[PDB]
Design a protein around this ligand. Structure first.
Ligand code: GTW
Ligand code: GTW
Ligand code: MG
Ligand code: MG
Ligand code: MG
Ligand code: MG
Lengths: 219, 224, 195, 212, 222, 204, 196, 195, 196
């Protein structure tokens, strides 16, 4: 996985690849790793995929109930706290490594959350097996207060670095652009690899397989 | 079997149109202690080869002596020692590769990752890797340890495949290498600001640059 | 405990179960019945860790006997086997799991059919024409693969079972001191006293 | 793996499966587990594939040097002991070898020796070696008698491998048959279990545990 | 503790035709999640119309290929420039591999060429030198992804003729060199899509009576 | 020792044009010992099908558990559960044993009765959802099935074309696995008919 | 990590580097290790980031609730709350925390809480992996009742050396000044401190 | 290998040795003779690790047979036992020790006396009226303590030995497939073919 | 142990503490860790006492035999002999040795040989357990071409701090001065250096 986020002038740009692996095998070439927390907050996910999925869903659910009671949009700090305090309580056994990004009443905020319950508040972050490839792109080219289409390109370039150079990462590039005026969920943003074309048709003709018995039941 | 004690970090390198560039920082770490700040880890052999070495420094110093001794030995009864029968990058590499794999196979490895960069007799760029296991590979960009994870991604954007080598000038390649050395300094906890860089060109020969420094450092976003 | 076999023929289920009880160096007993009658037409043989085997078998027996009194009815072999599997499947994630493997041989009075269930200590249930637990099956299944037919009589079942026990007596290293055999059919459970 | 060999009225039957595994990975189903040492000697292979193939090939070379040196066919007793004394020298180094040296000579008649990697060397009339030995022993032991014809013996050996091919996960592929007599060994075919199983089921009326 | 072995990934594939053989391999070399090279050749022409690959731990592979190439050279010297037949090469490799029985060459070795009757041959070795002549063999990381497909498409396994319903097997018709190359490329395309260690490039060496030819094809680089 | 490969076996599912297919082998073993060749791994709750590979006691337990849950679902909701909804139920149920999981590899297959859309899904043992359109594989020969499916599969197959694809994928993958085979079953599922076929395969 | 707190005439100054590593990878090079638990009671954090963050948040909570009921807490009280958490959960924590604060009554105060959960009140304190390298330097150069500029230079020079030798430390030198005047945040970049 | 017994009576030594050869799961043979004739009036039975047993026995046999040819003379049972003990005592500090235990039953033609020596794999030699190796002795020594007399006949020795084998067949867990019995007296070595 | 060698204008000075511990017991409090391998080539020893004594005796032998044949050896040559032993026997040795010597041609030279068996030529070197505490101090206070009195004070102050913080170090500070003038042994007691 290669997940990344940057803080730009108007808000936040999040990025992710789409490769889901079981060991060395690719189970899904186009899976979603940018999760919904609240309408103004999203979460990129790496580490143990189940932990990532159910931790984001639980905090999203609790924030929805929080937001219904208060009547106002939730903040990134509260999403950050709720994720943080839970992951800390489980002492690293919930293997969720998140890039949390959103836009508050108090402006745009970006966090990295680690399985053990530490969080860093940063202008750019990367996580997953492709974090070093992606971070190289950010150290090379990041600057504060970027324009939107520039930040989009930098994140896309950082995810691409992960896709190609890291074996754990691959597939398409998903982005999520968050500002005060809009939320753009771009899936896919880019398709850097074409699906490999097959030269032969290996599908068998009808009656090729040997059947013993058959049963038909209508519904 | 041993364990490495005093260590050197990333050696990075790439091919360009006429030759090769190689670089490495001047640090000898002693675990987390940044112990020795004046360690040269690029070791030139003749005027056509530079051997860049990472890992255990005592084993590097052993390899340095082996190469120094190799030059002496090649000169013996060799009237063409400075001409047709000079040491080639490919010869120097193959020797080291033989040594590295022999040592791993006696369960007593030289605890290093080595990149041999040079230019051959016929002008061909030579760039090949070997490590403590005797594992060898070549690529338009090569980097050891930490640089494999951070330097290669940046350097591969300049030379992504073989066909990009003739399109890459020495200025573009050297900029890329120096850029990568900056990125490594920000992010590698066992690196240093001071480094050495070596260009081996088929026309301009061996250029060895000492006491370089990482500059243009973006820290201003920290204050917020 | 060592060898427990089972074979379902036309109109009955036959359970053969070794007599030896060995604790380490010495054979303490050569006449041990490794079985409990759960209900009049359902028999369970068992083998596994010392203590756990009988404790489990007697616990299952007590529960089925309670059900029988409460409802004035005999549970089907399928129902008893499902109950037993759930008890083992519950057991496996306990603090201390029951290390007990079982065969449940029963005659379903409703369907007029013999039924043989093989369940291991994990709660792995399978209905079979013939079954075994532990190393026994390594020798015996190939015999039964060869010789078994679904329409066999109870006497043919007993002959096929002798052939299994002879093969085990020839090729197994432990002296299991022969087997007690029991037949489960429409008329209930009876012990073949000469084998 | 399932290898068997047994002695009867009309010689020796040798039957083997053809499957090679690396854990649960079926690496091949067309493997040769019988080595033809000479026209009168066979070796079966169980345990480590290399350790058998190598040292039993090497055995064949040592059997040749014997008959060059001594102008006489090597005895089965001597051939088997070359191999047993060899493996014994490597004892504790982790060779994995379960083998049968089957052959005929005028001096000893038909003879089978079991030799394994931990030094054991045993003469006998019936042996089954491999992960599926128990399955083969079951069928073989319960249909055996000296009496048997060459047609019935060949079939019983074929069938006892089929038995193990079915139940043992690490056995299968095909059955390679051999018949050893006073005149030498005779190959009696390669029988794919894919087709043999359904044929044997239909013709014999066995394998009723199966849907088909 | 020092571990003398490593895993450089990679995947190789040998297929024996009627009067030809192919030995293919991906050109990617890796360690863990890093790519070392996108083009590091793995399948080698060893002379005498024999092609070889020793996939696995690249150092042990390089060592073995080097030793065998040298074994070919010394066979010429010692036996009056006689051609090393593929079967003789195979047995020689068994002894090379078994020589290190108690400290193995951590590789799956495959050779390909022509037998002495001019027919296509592939031989396949485990790390300690057990070997056999085979019609079809994939080795390395994605071998489990490729072999079932080859059972199905080369040997027509589980395939029967329409209308007979399981009674008559699909007949075992011979595959041309163009047909085999399609299977190789598509096997590697599939393996590349589903295995993270497979990609970058595919290099195929084709052996016929006319000699050893090469073909190269791009593979997906992520 | 490894609970996911004691008993052995496989499941594969595929989508086609207005149809899905799910298939499984019939083996149950104790490692090398084959025990049963009638251990089916595909179950159904209404029109939603669930394949489960792995530790057989958990396969059985989960089937019984999802029957339980889907029955109460139907009584309360007054309608049969849909594949999308069930998939979420499986994921929830697996993840609630996060630190003592069921050693299983479930696979959902079915057609959404309202939209008519063919649906498949897969899970790891702790409930992460593999949500792929093309195919889902599971079991001791999953690698083998991945290879077979990737090369054989193509989108929008007609029911009897898809049957030949999924069957050949299962059979050839199983024959390269020691712990899979001993028979096989293939369900071809359409919006209002289901065809269940048992396959003839080698019995070793 | 390299962290220190130093009392001086007008109050107290906390100082820290900004490097956080995962082995040899610098995960965060602009880390803020000086965290606020009350208006003029701050702490320097070393050890597990998850543990020291979790503790500092709990302390902030306790002191917020103390303030609601009993007014501004003493620096000693803050140190006691830190200690209570660190000592009672010593088996499950890896936290080395320096607590520093300004009262008007007590002026500047520095309390160090090492791994055991013991408390030590000191004129200055040093901690973190990089602190080993500057025990010699800090003992020779520290004086009591220094001026603000002297104490900034003492911390800057000390952490400059800690950074130079410790690979685990690096980046910018952050400082936080605590006096009657208020709270001042200072930052010093590599180009400034490396040439000292 | 499992059970090897020995009993020295008035005018002979009797060695009983089990017939089973078990490799793990299966009993590979039920007619194995765990003995070698070292000289015409000296017999050695053996039990221990696979391979090592026969290799050691055959090696000792070859050496004693060489001595016999060189000197045209039979070594006394005492001398053969001392040779064997030294070979084992040498073995125990080797790179790979012989894991073999032995009984040497011999008739000393000079003294006109039967002699039984018990030697373990460490080279621990003892002359005994009756001996055993492994677990056998735990059962059999108490019988022999009760019933043995030094003046017993060979037939009385064989009856006392049947009582030992019956007790072992009753109380030992492993099926050792009966025993081959051999008598060593003034006239040499002969096998009791019915036991 | 706390040891150092420092080059200066007139040559080089070696310095060492005198404590040798067996765990917490001070086995020898008056240890001489400055050992002579040649007239004006000495070494500071840290690590296993058995190993460093054994090495120093072998080196002394080699240089004695060198001197018999080829005249006075260079300080570089001495360091090479130390290295050769330490590197080739790295698996069986625990020796951290500083080699210091005075030629007339080369003047003062200092070579450090850490655990690996690598060699490093330096203007000054520090080593031993107590050296960690004075990296900061020594880097800030060292200058090249110091006078004899300045270098004695630099070493005295440095080892004074090393001793203060390191329990493994202590006792007297021994020094050995190597110049053209000859070889001078200095000693400094606790009552002198502790009050610095
Ligand atoms: C990339 C993270 S990486 C390579 O840096 O660890 C992805 C992240 C991700 C996030 C969300 C989704 C969709 N909900 C998919 C993927 N992570 C993975 O692919 C997981 C990586 C594993 C690395 C080894 C340690 C476990 C995590 N893979 C999984 O979580 C898979 C689930 C897929 C969908 C089948 N589970 C396993 O591989 C497991 C094996 N054994 C387990 C207990 S979980
Ligand atoms: C069945 C014997 S079994 C299941 O009872 O152990 C076969 C016997 C056999 C005999 C001859 C030939 C001729 N080429 C092939 C096969 N044995 C095997 O399949 C080996 C099973 C191993 C199980 C674990 C204990 C060692 C034996 N398989 C191997 O020897 C394989 C052979 C490959 C798949 C071709 N090699 C490995 O397992 C290796 C793994 N790592 C190595 C360095 S070698
Ligand atoms: Mg099977
Ligand atoms: Mg790929
Ligand atoms: Mg199969
Ligand atoms: Mg630093």
């Amino acid at each position: 996985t290669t997940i990344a986020g940057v803080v730009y002038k108007d808000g936040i740009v999040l990025g992710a690849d789409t490769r889901a692996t079981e060991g060395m095998v690719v189970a899904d070439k186009n899976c979603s790793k940018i999760h919904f927390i609240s309408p103004n907050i999203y979460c990129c996910g790496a580490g143990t995929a189940a932990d990532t999925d159910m931790t984001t869903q639980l905090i999203s659910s609790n924030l929805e109930l929080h937001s219904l009671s208060t009547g106002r949009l939730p903040r990134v700090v509260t999403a950050n706290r709720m994720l943080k305090q839970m992951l800390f309580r489980y002492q690293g056994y919930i293997g969720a490594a998140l890039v949390l990004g959103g836009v508050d009443v108090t402006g745009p905020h970006l966090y990295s959350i680690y399985p053990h319950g530490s969080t860093d508040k940063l202008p750019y972050v990367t996580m997953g097996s492709g974090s070093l490839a992606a971070m190289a792109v950010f150290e090379d080219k990041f600057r504060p207060d970027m324009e939107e289409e520039e930040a989009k390109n930098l994140v896309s370039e950082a995810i691409a670095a992960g896709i190609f150079n890291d074996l754990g990462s691959g597939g398409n590039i998903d982005l999520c652009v968050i500002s005060k005026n809009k939320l753009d969920f771009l899936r896919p943003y880019t398709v850097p690899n074409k699906k490999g074309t097959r030269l032969g048709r290996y599908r068998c003709e009808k009656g090729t397989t040997a059947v013993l018995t058959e049963k038909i039941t209508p519904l | 079997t041993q364990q490495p004690i005093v260590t050197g970090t990333s050696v990075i390198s790439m091919k360009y149109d006429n030759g090769v560039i190689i670089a490495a920082d001047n640090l000898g770490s002693y675990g987390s202690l940044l112990r020795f700040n004046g360690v040269e880890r690029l070791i030139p052999v003749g005027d056509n080869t530079v051997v860049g070495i990472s890992g255990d420094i005592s084993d590097m110093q052993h390899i340095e002596r082996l190469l120094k001794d190799l030059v002496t030995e090649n000169a013996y009864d060799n009237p063409l020692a400075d001409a047709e029968e000079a040491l080639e990058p490919s010869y120097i590499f193959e020797y080291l590769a033989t040594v590295m794999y022999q040592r791993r196979s006696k369960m007593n490895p030289l605890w290093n990752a080595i990149i041999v960069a040079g230019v051959q007799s016929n002008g061909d760029q030579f760039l090949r890797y070997v490590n403590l296991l005797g594992v060898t590979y070549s690529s338009p960009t090569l980097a050891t340890g930490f640089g494999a994870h951070m330097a290669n991604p940046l350097l591969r954007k300049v030379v992504d495949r073989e066909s990009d080598i003739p399109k890459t000038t020495v200025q573009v390649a050297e900029e890329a290498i120096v850029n990568a050395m900056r990125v490594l300094y920000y992010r590698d906890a066992r690196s240093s600001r001071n480094f050495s860089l070596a260009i081996i060109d088929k026309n301009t020969g061996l250029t060895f640059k000492k006491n370089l420094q990482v500059e243009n450092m973006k820290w201003d976003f920290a204050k917020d | 405990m060592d060898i427990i076999l089972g074979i379902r023929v036309q109109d009955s289920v036959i359970l053969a179960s070794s007599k030896a009880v060995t604790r380490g160096i010495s054979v303490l007993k050569d006449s041990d019945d490794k079985t409990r009658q759960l209900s009049p037409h359902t028999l369970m043989s068992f083998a596994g860790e010392a203590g756990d085997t009988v404790q489990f078998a007697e616990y299952i027996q007590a529960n089925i006997q309670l059900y029988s009194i409460r409802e004035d009815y005999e549970l089907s072999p399928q129902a008893v086997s499902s109950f037993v599997r759930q008890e083992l499947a519950k057991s496996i994630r306990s603090r201390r799991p029951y290390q007990v493997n079982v065969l449940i041989g029963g005659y379903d009075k409703k369907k007029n059919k013999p039924e043989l269930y093989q369940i291991d200590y994990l709660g792995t249930k399978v209905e079979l024409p013939y079954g075994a637990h532990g190393y026994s099956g390594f020798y015996t299944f190939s015999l039964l693969d060869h010789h078994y037919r679904p329409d066999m009589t109870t006497e043919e079942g007993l002959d096929l079972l002798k052939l299994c026990v002879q093969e085990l007596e020839k090729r197994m290293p432990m002296d299991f001191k022969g087997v007690i055999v029991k037949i489960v059919d429409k008329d209930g459970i009876r012990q073949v006293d000469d084998f | 793996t399932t290898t068997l060999a047994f002695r009867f009225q009309g010689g020796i039957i040798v039957a083997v499966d053809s499957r090679a595994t690396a854990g649960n990975w079926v690496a091949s189903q067309t493997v040769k587990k019988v080595i033809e040492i000479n026209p009168f000697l066979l070796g079966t292979m169980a345990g480590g594939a290399a350790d058998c193939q190598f040292w039993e090939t090497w055995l064949g070379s040592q059997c040749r040097l014997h008959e060059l040196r001594e102008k006489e066919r090597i005895s089965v007793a001597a051939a088997s002991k070359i191999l047993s004394n060899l493996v014994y020298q490597y004892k504790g180094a982790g060779l994995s070898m379960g083998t049968m040296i089957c052959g005929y000579t005028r001096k000893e008649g038909p003879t089978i020796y079991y030799v394994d990697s931990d030094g054991t060397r045993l003469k006998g009339d019936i042996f089954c070696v491999g992960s599926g030995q128990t399955f083969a022993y079951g069928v073989l032991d319960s249909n055996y008698k000296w009496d048997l014809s060459v047609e019935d013996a060949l079939y019983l050996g074929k069938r006892s491998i089929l038995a193990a091919a079915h139940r043992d996960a690490y056995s299968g592929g095909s059955v390679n048959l051999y018949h050893v007599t006073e005149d030498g060994w005779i190959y009696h075919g390669n029988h794919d279990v894919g087709e043999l199983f359904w044929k044997v089921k239909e013709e014999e009326g066995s394998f009723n545990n199966v849907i088909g | 503790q020092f571990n003398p072995y490593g895993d450089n990934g990679g995947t190789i594939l040998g297929i024996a035709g009627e009067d030809f053989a192919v030995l293919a391999g991906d050109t990617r070399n890796i360690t863990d999640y890093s790519i070392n090279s996108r083009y590091e050749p793995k399948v080698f022409d060893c002379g005498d119309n024999i092609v070889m690959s020793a996939n696995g731990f690249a150092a042990d592979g390089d060592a073995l290929v080097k030793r065998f190439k040298n074994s070919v050279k010394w066979y010429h010297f010692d036996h009056n420039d006689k051609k090393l037949s593929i079967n003789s090469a195979a047995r020689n490799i068994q002894h090379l591999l078994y020589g290190k029985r108690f400290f193995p060459y951590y590789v799956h070795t495959i050779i390909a060429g022509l037998d002495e009757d001019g027919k296509g041959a592939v031989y396949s070795f485990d790390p300690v030198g057990s070997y056999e002549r085979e019609q079809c063999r994939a080795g390395g990381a994605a071998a489990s992804l490729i072999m079932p497909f080859l059972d199905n498409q080369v040997n027509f396994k589980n395939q029967y003729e329409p209308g007979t319903n399981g009674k008559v097997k699909k007949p075992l018709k011979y595959l041309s060199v163009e047909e085999v190359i399609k299977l190789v490329r598509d096997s590697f395309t599939s393996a590349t899509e589903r295995h993270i260690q497979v990609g970058d490039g595919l290099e195929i060496l084709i052996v016929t009576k006319d000699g050893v030819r090469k073909e190269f094809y791009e593979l997906k680089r992520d | 020792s490894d609970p996911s490969s004691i008993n052995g076996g496989i499941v594969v599912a595929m989508t086609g044009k207005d149809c899905v297919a799910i298939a499984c082998d019939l083996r149950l073993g104790s490692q090398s010992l084959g025990v049963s060749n009638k251990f089916e791994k595909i179950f159904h709750y209404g029109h939603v099908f669930l394949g489960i590979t792995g530790l057989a006691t958990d396969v059985t337990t989960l089937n019984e558990m999802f029957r339980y849950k889907t029955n109460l679902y139907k009584l309360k909701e007054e309608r049969a559960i849909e594949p999308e909804t069930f998939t979420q139920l499986v994921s929830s149920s697996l993840y609630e044993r996060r630190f003592g999981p069921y050693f299983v590899g479930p696979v959902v297959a079915g057609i959404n009765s309202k939209s008519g859309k063919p649906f498949i899904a897969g899970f790891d043992l702790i409930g992460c959802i593999d949500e792929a359109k093309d195919f889902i594989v599971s079991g001791t020969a999953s690698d083998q099935l991945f290879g077979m499916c990737e090369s054989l599969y193509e989108p929008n197959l007609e029911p009897e074309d898809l049957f030949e694809t999924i069957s050949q994928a299962l059979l050839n993958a199983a024959d390269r696995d020691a712990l899979s085979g001993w028979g096989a079953v293939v369900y071809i599922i359409k919006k209002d008919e289901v065809v269940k076929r048992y396959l003839k395969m080698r019995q070793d | 990590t390299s962290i220190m707190a130093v009392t001086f005439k007008d109050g107290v100054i906390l100082g820290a580097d900004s490097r956080t590593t995962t082995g040899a990878y610098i995960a965060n090079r602009v880390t803020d290790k000086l965290t606020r638990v009350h208006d003029k009671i701050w702490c320097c954090r070393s050890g597990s980031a998850a543990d020291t963050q979790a503790i500092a948040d709990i302390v902030q909570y306790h002191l917020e609730l103390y303030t609601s009921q009993y007014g501004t807490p003493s620096t000693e009280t803050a140190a006691s709350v830190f200690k209570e958490l660190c000592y009672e959960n010593k088996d499950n924590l890896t936290a080395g925390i320096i607590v520093a604060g300004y009262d008007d009554k007590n002026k500047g105060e520095v309390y160090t809480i090492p791994l055991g959960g013991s408390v030590h009140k000191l004129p200055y304190a040093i901690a973190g992996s990089g602190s080993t390298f500057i025990y010699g330097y800090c003992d020779k150069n520290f004086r009591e009742n220094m001026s603000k500029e002297e104490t900034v230079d003492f911390i800057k020079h000390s952490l400059s050396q800690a950074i130079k030798w410790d690979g685990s430390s690096g980046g910018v030198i952050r400082m936080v000044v605590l006096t009657a005047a208020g709270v001042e945040r200072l930052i010093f970049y590599p180009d400034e401190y490396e040439q000292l």
